[PDB]
Design a protein around this motif. Structure first.
Motif, mmCIF file in Angstrom:
data_model
loop_
_atom_site.group_PDB
_atom_site.id
_atom_site.type_symbol
_atom_site.label_atom_id
_atom_site.label_comp_id
_atom_site.label_asym_id
_atom_site.label_seq_id
_atom_site.Cartn_x
_atom_site.Cartn_y
_atom_site.Cartn_z
ATOM 1 N N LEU A 167 8.016 90.527 5.308
ATOM 2 C CA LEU A 167 8.108 90.506 6.763
ATOM 3 C C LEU A 167 9.282 91.336 7.257
ATOM 4 O O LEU A 167 9.154 92.107 8.214
ATOM 5 C CB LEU A 167 8.232 89.068 7.262
ATOM 6 C CG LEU A 167 6.929 88.264 7.196
ATOM 7 C CD1 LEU A 167 7.171 86.780 7.430
ATOM 8 C CD2 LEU A 167 5.900 88.794 8.198
ATOM 9 N N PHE A 234 -1.948 98.967 1.510
ATOM 10 C CA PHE A 234 -2.142 97.972 2.556
ATOM 11 C C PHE A 234 -1.842 96.566 2.050
ATOM 12 O O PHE A 234 -2.193 95.589 2.708
ATOM 13 C CB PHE A 234 -3.568 98.080 3.104
ATOM 14 C CG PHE A 234 -3.781 97.456 4.459
ATOM 15 C CD1 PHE A 234 -3.019 97.811 5.553
ATOM 16 C CD2 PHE A 234 -4.806 96.544 4.641
ATOM 17 C CE1 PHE A 234 -3.267 97.235 6.794
ATOM 18 C CE2 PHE A 234 -5.050 95.992 5.872
ATOM 19 C CZ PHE A 234 -4.276 96.322 6.936
ATOM 20 N N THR A 236 1.107 93.918 1.226
ATOM 21 C CA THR A 236 2.499 93.509 1.210
ATOM 22 C C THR A 236 2.559 91.994 1.303
ATOM 23 O O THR A 236 1.739 91.361 1.978
ATOM 24 C CB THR A 236 3.300 94.178 2.323
ATOM 25 O OG1 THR A 236 4.694 94.022 2.047
ATOM 26 C CG2 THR A 236 2.984 93.610 3.705
ATOM 27 N N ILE B 143 4.348 80.579 3.741
ATOM 28 C CA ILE B 143 3.833 81.743 4.446
ATOM 29 C C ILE B 143 4.912 82.744 4.817
ATOM 30 O O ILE B 143 4.580 83.822 5.298
ATOM 31 C CB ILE B 143 3.035 81.344 5.704
ATOM 32 C CG1 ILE B 143 3.915 80.697 6.762
ATOM 33 C CG2 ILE B 143 1.878 80.447 5.318
ATOM 34 C CD1 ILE B 143 3.201 80.500 8.100
ATOM 35 N N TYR B 250 -5.183 84.529 12.872
ATOM 36 C CA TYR B 250 -4.405 85.708 13.216
ATOM 37 C C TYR B 250 -3.528 85.428 14.428
ATOM 38 O O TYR B 250 -3.825 84.553 15.246
ATOM 39 C CB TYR B 250 -5.329 86.874 13.578
ATOM 40 C CG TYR B 250 -5.975 87.590 12.429
ATOM 41 C CD1 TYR B 250 -5.327 88.634 11.802
ATOM 42 C CD2 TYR B 250 -7.251 87.248 11.996
ATOM 43 C CE1 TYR B 250 -5.911 89.309 10.760
ATOM 44 C CE2 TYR B 250 -7.848 87.915 10.954
ATOM 45 C CZ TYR B 250 -7.173 88.946 10.336
ATOM 46 O OH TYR B 250 -7.761 89.622 9.295
ATOM 47 N N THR C 243 -4.711 92.971 3.295
ATOM 48 C CA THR C 243 -4.611 92.494 4.660
ATOM 49 C C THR C 243 -3.440 93.062 5.434
ATOM 50 O O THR C 243 -3.303 92.734 6.614
ATOM 51 C CB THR C 243 -4.434 90.978 4.691
ATOM 52 O OG1 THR C 243 -3.135 90.704 4.153
ATOM 53 C CG2 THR C 243 -5.497 90.251 3.897
ATOM 54 N N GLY C 244 -2.565 93.837 4.811
ATOM 55 C CA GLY C 244 -1.400 94.318 5.508
ATOM 56 C C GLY C 244 -0.407 93.259 5.910
ATOM 57 O O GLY C 244 0.425 93.514 6.787
ATOM 58 N N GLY C 245 -0.460 92.079 5.293
ATOM 59 C CA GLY C 245 0.456 91.007 5.601
ATOM 60 C C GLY C 245 0.041 90.085 6.725
ATOM 61 O O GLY C 245 0.867 89.298 7.186
ATOM 62 N N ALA C 246 -1.211 90.150 7.179
ATOM 63 C CA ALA C 246 -1.631 89.389 8.352
ATOM 64 C C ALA C 246 -1.460 87.889 8.182
ATOM 65 O O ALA C 246 -1.253 87.170 9.171
ATOM 66 C CB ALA C 246 -3.090 89.692 8.671
ATOM 67 N N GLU C 247 -1.570 87.388 6.957
ATOM 68 C CA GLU C 247 -1.462 85.956 6.709
ATOM 69 C C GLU C 247 -0.029 85.454 6.662
ATOM 70 O O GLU C 247 0.181 84.238 6.562
ATOM 71 C CB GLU C 247 -2.160 85.610 5.394
ATOM 72 C CG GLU C 247 -1.483 86.072 4.113
ATOM 73 C CD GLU C 247 -1.669 87.526 3.772
ATOM 74 O OE1 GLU C 247 -2.339 88.262 4.521
ATOM 75 O OE2 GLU C 247 -1.128 87.928 2.727
ATOM 76 N N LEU C 248 0.943 86.351 6.732
ATOM 77 C CA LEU C 248 2.353 85.989 6.642
ATOM 78 C C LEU C 248 2.938 85.624 7.988
ATOM 79 O O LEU C 248 2.606 86.223 9.009
ATOM 80 C CB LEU C 248 3.157 87.156 6.082
ATOM 81 C CG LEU C 248 2.675 87.731 4.772
ATOM 82 C CD1 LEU C 248 3.510 88.952 4.451
ATOM 83 C CD2 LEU C 248 2.753 86.684 3.672
#
Ligand SMILES: NC(=O)c1ccc[n+]([C@@H]2O[C@H](COP(=O)([O-])OP(=O)(O)OC[C@H]3O[C@@H](n4cnc5c(N)ncnc54)[C@H](O)[C@@H]3O)[C@@H](O)[C@H]2O)c1
Ligand SMILES: NC(=O)c1ccc[n+]([C@@H]2O[C@H](COP(=O)([O-])OP(=O)(O)OC[C@H]3O[C@@H](n4cnc5c(N)ncnc54)[C@H](O)[C@@H]3O)[C@@H](O)[C@H]2O)c1
Ligand SMILES: NC(=O)c1ccc[n+]([C@@H]2O[C@H](COP(=O)([O-])OP(=O)(O)OC[C@H]3O[C@@H](n4cnc5c(N)ncnc54)[C@H](O)[C@@H]3O)[C@@H](O)[C@H]2O)c1
Ligand SMILES: NC(=O)c1ccc[n+]([C@@H]2O[C@H](COP(=O)([O-])OP(=O)(O)OC[C@H]3O[C@@H](n4cnc5c(N)ncnc54)[C@H](O)[C@@H]3O)[C@@H](O)[C@H]2O)c1
Ligand SMILES: O=C(c1cccc(-c2cccc(O)c2F)n1)c1cccc(O)c1O
Ligand SMILES: O=C(c1cccc(-c2cccc(O)c2F)n1)c1cccc(O)c1O
Ligand SMILES: O=C(c1cccc(-c2cccc(O)c2F)n1)c1cccc(O)c1O
Ligand SMILES: O=C(c1cccc(-c2cccc(O)c2F)n1)c1cccc(O)c1O
Ligand code: NA
Ligand code: NA
Ligand code: NA
Ligand code: NA
Lengths: 251, 251, 251, 251
Positions: A167, A234, A236, B143, B250, C243-248
């Motif tokens: 992040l 893509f 991370t 997370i 999301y 996912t490019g980190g979307a779940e973080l």
């Protein structure tokens, strides 16, 4: 032979085991690799064996050693693209009442804070190259292990810290991912089995803990690391399980 | 009023916030509760307010304080059934380059090793009572969170350590579980918001981070703790999310 | 150009979008690729464009079409090494009260049972080649999505079925893995955005849903598929997030 | 005896097993309970045994039966507060090549679409009462099971659908959660064991699959359901594991 050509990689604990597998995988993909280890025996031999790998003696728990490691990498190669935080240790089995706060702190210094310190010192250079960090955690950070409270705690911390760093560094395009291996045949696995009442039984149990019916190889972790560095643009903050299915089903 | 009657519970960090909510929930369920805190102000008032709660001054980072806490609990009440490891701290937001190894070690001492030490010292008594341990972790251990590398690491460690301890203590019938709250309105949340450029905006953002559209209350974490202690007899090693849905979808 | 040389891959829904990205990635790795699609327009053009790809018209919801697909693949190429179950659909946003059991069944036929049928019919050939299966699921099967109850259910089923099949096929050395993409820019994404009151706003929101600040590309899913097929020999039953980190973090 | 007093609960598959345990738990908490089952034998006896429970014959795969169930519940009791979707079936062990699309569709009708249909028809009444939905999924939806591809797929779908519905219904204050049990001793477990070559060995293996060394009881799932309905007011979209630790560690 060219999927990571021209890039510079630092691998901690690179002198044997998983780390040496990762070193070999990156050399085979065209990268220049700095082998960081506190033990000279394996790392010096690997430097002689591999075109494109060099050995720097460095104990990742000593902040001054790590500062030197980073400055020497830049001085010698002019850039830094990938840090692989692999150095770590698994103590022998210990019931909770047999563990000590002192031993827990020492394990945190290696398995967690060594990874933190190198990452922090490398970030200015990784931001310039839009590079990436790969942490080597463990399946048992996710699912637990018996007689290993301190080890499990340290690996749960590494996996979580990976997500936090992902992040923080996403605005710079720096990716931060971890690999969580299951049973991989390495000198550490062999040394721990040798402590058991019946080492042969322990090894057999270790092979059968996976649906695939074998332990993993260092080269397999190495291939996963090269993928994360070179082709997972893509991805991370992910935890990539390299476990042979050990976390699946009942047992 | 009787679902945990006759049982003895220790709550660390019980003087305010989530900890005080947990204290109140256990008193209301018939338990005798030891409030452990390093600050006298809140805990002394709670002891005066609540029949069945007593305050013991104890800094969980000091091993000798914790030894005294356990010995005094047994001396006063004759048994120990449940330990709730709630004491912890969230530092202000810090970018990775702003953190220090020293600050990271200090946070590990509180958020991780304090939980370890009390648990270890209590286990002989919990094994006799077939009692249980409840650790208070955090959703962000699972997370991630921005500008919080040390905090996130400590909570990932707590969640993982919970699973390891559950495996070790299962032969004795001792259950070990954790609660991972999301945004809960407490004095810590208020103090951190006050540091932000616009505290009102930070609080509004914090309420809207959950699909349920509000922050959680300490009493809600308290009810989850009473459930885990008194009624979750086939649950061990679980992470119970008390987050209002923040991890869903999301954003 | 040789990491999957000599191998034969079937990609369902290969005529556009993610599927076409996967086709291209496997052709570039030396494989022969069967493009399966119910629509001729994209797949026929890809067959003309790519040396080593051929198009077979096949609706994966029709059992007889799938039987023909498998028999033709073996007749033409003599072996089968990898099946990529990518065909699927995301309906427009629907509140629960707006969905129908009929529409839910139709979506299950495509997103779940089409994947099941091809996998089942291919398994005898995959067991002979020690091949592998790659299912394309979705991040929202893991974390949910609003206004998409049927879609989310179908993708939760695919991810779970992957783990079950991995257990069943492990004795044969056949690996079964899934990729769960987040927002990937494809014609489906474009078609769904066009239905929204403000398509431009929907697309901007879709780019900002990832810490990396962009949507993913089909080529990035393709690279992950090639890794799973060719280099992930100790991975089975995994869910690889792209996912490019979307779940973080919080949002 | 009063933690869910005055509330109305529908439990599907309530005539035996886990469902009957849930019925009993809610009656003991002061609720009025509608027992829904396709088999009269168990449900009629439970209605005679329990003050405050009534039996309605209803096959949840028949849309008209479910419409009647909901209308009769409102006609008789004036409100609806909680729906527990427990009805489901586990077929005997089947290798992938032994399964059929037809059998898969039939299992989807029961385990997934029956849960969907009742939930959809109940939502207008749950929105008025700010009620909640509890789905009974399975641990194997998360971790897989051998020789159970269709069952595992259906339970992965239920868990995912829970998260989607939680997002959709959060604006109304309606919570949607699931319980994922591990091995619970029920008539289904007994019937499946009886099919095995050595039932006694299968049962022993089932007890030892949990670190706690026993199977769970229906009453334990029932207590978890009452907690989710009555006291988990900041929980939505969660998966509550009631497994005795089966998902922990290596095996
Ligand atoms: N082997 C497994 O099954 C397994 C499974 C999961 C995770 N892991 C993780 O993989 C990593 C490597 O494990 P391995 O089995 O290859 O171990 P190993 O003991 O075979 O190799 C570890 C290497 O790290 C070096 N090292 C140790 N402390 C160091 C320090 N202070 N500074 C620098 N180098 C140091 C050692 O000298 C050695 O060369 C560890 O993080 C371990 O936790 C291993
Ligand atoms: N508030 C949230 O949103 C939130 C979210 C997730 C997790 N948590 C966790 O919940 C726990 C409680 O958080 P809170 O918001 O109630 O915090 P708080 O700061 O309001 O209360 C913490 C209490 O712990 C005490 N404490 C601190 N250090 C101690 C020590 N060394 N020894 C003994 N007591 C000590 C403090 O004096 C205080 O009474 C922490 O572990 C925190 O990480 C909080
Ligand atoms: N685009 C995203 O952001 C996204 C995200 C997560 C998952 N996915 C998944 O990725 C997969 C591909 O999505 P996409 O965005 O590329 O979609 P797309 O609509 O652009 O392409 C899907 C392709 O599948 C084909 N297809 C549809 N039904 C078929 C059938 N019955 N038989 C054979 N072929 C059929 C279509 O003709 C088309 O060529 C789907 O499974 C989708 O659920 C997509
Ligand atoms: N027993 C376990 O170990 C276990 C483990 C995990 C999950 N589960 C889940 O728990 C639930 C209950 O399992 P159980 O072991 O109590 O099963 P069970 O077979 O003992 O009881 C199921 C009940 O549901 C009823 N039912 C079946 N089909 C129905 C229909 N069409 N309409 C209405 N009622 C119907 C049956 O008549 C029966 O009374 C199922 O969803 C199962 O998947 C069970
Ligand atoms: O190194 C090991 C290892 C090697 C041999 C035995 C054990 C072992 C087995 C059961 C209980 C224990 O406390 C153990 F230490 N572990 C290891 C294993 C899994 C994951 C890892 O991360 C690892 O490092
Ligand atoms: O206390 C907090 C908290 C309160 C106010 C702001 C923030 C905050 C928000 C964004 C980034 C940060 O680095 C933050 F510290 N956190 C907290 C929040 C979630 C989970 C927890 O465990 C917690 O303790
Ligand atoms: O295709 C989509 C997509 C494209 C555009 C909008 C939406 C969308 C956004 C919010 C709520 C909804 O119900 C939506 F359908 N989805 C998709 C997205 C994520 C994961 C996927 O698997 C996908 O396929
Ligand atoms: O009912 C069962 C059950 C009972 C007896 C044997 C088995 C069994 C064991 C190994 C492989 C299989 O394919 C099995 F069906 N299962 C069940 C178990 C776990 C989770 C559940 O959701 C369940 O319903
Ligand atoms: Na060299
Ligand atoms: Na008092
Ligand atoms: Na061609
Ligand atoms: Na009755």
């Amino acid at each position: 032979g060219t999927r990571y050509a021209g890039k510079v990689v630092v691998v901690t604990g690179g002198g044997r085991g998983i780390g040496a597998g990762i070193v070999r995988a990156f050399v085979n993909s065209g990268a220049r690799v700095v082998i960081c280890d506190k033990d000279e025996s394996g790392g010096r031999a690997l430097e002689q064996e591999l075109p494109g790998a060099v050995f720097i003696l460095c104990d990742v728990t000593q902040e001054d050693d790590v500062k030197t490691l980073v400055s020497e990498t830049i001085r010698r190669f002019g850039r830094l693209d990938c840090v692989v935080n692999n150095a770590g240790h698994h103590p022998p089995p210990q019931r909770p009442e047999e563990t000590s706060a002192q031993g827990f702190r020492q394990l945190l210094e290696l398995n967690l804070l060594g990874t933190y310190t190198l990452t922090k010192l490398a970030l200015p250079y990784l931001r310039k190259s839009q590079g990436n960090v790969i942490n080597i955690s463990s399946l048992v950070g996710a699912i637990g292990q018996a007689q290993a409270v301190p080890y499990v705690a340290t690996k749960g911390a590494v996996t979580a810290m990976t997500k936090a760093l992902a992040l923080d560094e996403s605005p710079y395009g720096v990716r931060v991912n971890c690999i969580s291996p299951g049973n991989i045949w390495t000198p550490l696995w062999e040394e721990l089995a040798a402590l058991m009442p019946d080492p042969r039984a322990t090894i057999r149990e270790g092979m059968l803990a996976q649906p695939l019916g074998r332990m993993g190889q260092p080269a397999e972790v190495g291939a996963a690391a090269v993928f994360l560095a070179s082709e997972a643009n893509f991805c991370t903050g992910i935890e990539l399980l390299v476990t042979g299915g050990a976390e699946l089903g009942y047992g």
